[PDB]
Symmetry: D2
Subunit: 121 residues, 4 copies
Amino acid sequence: AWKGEVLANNEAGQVTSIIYNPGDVITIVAAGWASYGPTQKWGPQGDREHPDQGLICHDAFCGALVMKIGNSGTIPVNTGLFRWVAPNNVQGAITLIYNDVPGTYGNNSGSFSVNIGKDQS
Amino acid sequence: AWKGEVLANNEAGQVTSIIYNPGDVITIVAAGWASYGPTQKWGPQGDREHPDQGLICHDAFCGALVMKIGNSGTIPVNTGLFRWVAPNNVQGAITLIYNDVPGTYGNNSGSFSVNIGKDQS
Amino acid sequence: AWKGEVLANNEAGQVTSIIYNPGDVITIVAAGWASYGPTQKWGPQGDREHPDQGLICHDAFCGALVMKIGNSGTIPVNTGLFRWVAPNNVQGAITLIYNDVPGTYGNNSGSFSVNIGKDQS
Amino acid sequence: AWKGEVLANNEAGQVTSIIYNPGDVITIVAAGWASYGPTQKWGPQGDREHPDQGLICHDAFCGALVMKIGNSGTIPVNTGLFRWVAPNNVQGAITLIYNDVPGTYGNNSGSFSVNIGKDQS
Ligand SMILES: N#Cc1cccc(O)c1O
Ligand SMILES: N#Cc1cccc(O)c1O
Ligand SMILES: [Ca+2]
Ligand SMILES: [Ca+2]
Ligand SMILES: [Ca+2]
Ligand SMILES: [Ca+2]
């Protein structure tokens, strides 16, 4: 299993120790509070109201937790994933990233605490 | 495992099929958008700015997901629990409940989608 | 999980710390060599050529590993059980026992090494 | 999980669907009766009394269940493996094989029923 923190102001995201292999079943639970700029903070699903001005993940809200598996496109995580299997032809290290617009991470604050483990399959 | 919806306006809570037994390790993942009255909706950690006006769980924000296990008090769930073991002598059916003040559930809207499973132990 | 030895000469059986509860999925792996009397030894499926002369479990060979769950009748374990669920209304502490004739355990020797764990469900 | 049979007379062995990857925890349960030639049959630990006349696996008895992981040598499985991590960081497809002398599989009979799964990690 892997446990760690993803900072909202880290545009590169945090690589985890989890290498996703074909057929792996994984669980993710994310918690905590972060902001893309405003004084209000949001949970790992982000801010439902905020328009999309070029987010790294168009399938999630601004301020949501997303991931890459190896060199994949962004995948929404939000609060987490329950005994989840990735699409065909996605494999490699899981990287966790705060969903914001490239070049706009400098005014971000807070972080999410994340647990990931592989499940029985 | 158990999957289902926990309506924010459901004061009695949602009874699951899960009986928590001594030594059980469980995982809960909760997702979605709910409100205790306003247009704005919050995720399963609730509204970190809202005062406690007599919440059924004083250890979680207004609009958080909480649970009872048998004869237990309310226990915070928020976004979920990763490979979690209950306190000593806590056992019985899991009921999930939206965290609001008794008598104030009628103006609530939306729901959380919740997955509960027992893990390897 | 539980790990230990089940001696062939133990008529009372080996009490494990594992309480089987309704809906539990369990895995048992058993290994090793034991005898009901002769100088030869058999594995956990016992001696397929020995007649049943009053075995505690008529559904397993003499020198097989069997079990009770609470005060159930004996249930064959043999080499083990993979992600196994008990019949309805069977619950309680797992006792592991060597399959022999009551009052004839005294000339037995050797032991099986046994692992039990609860699986994701 | 993979569920199959290993025929005692199959010299090439049974390729499974299981790809063992680094960090994987696996459980195997093997059951049944098989012969390397004689009328008698043995369980998955094989015949403890038989010499090694050129077995494919030199640290398991004649008539035992053994496996290869990718490019590994033969690894003893016997009655099975409980939440087991492969030594030497081996990886690749699991092949199951009955332990007999190469060129002598023609007179074998019976089969082992085998279940393999990946476990929580
Ligand atoms: N907490 C709270 C609360 C206070 C007033 C009215 C409501 O509907 C509420 O949910
Ligand atoms: N071990 C062995 C062996 C030796 C001779 C003939 C066989 O069929 C065997 O299986
Ligand atoms: Ca920003
Ligand atoms: Ca309300
Ligand atoms: Ca005896
Ligand atoms: Ca042969």
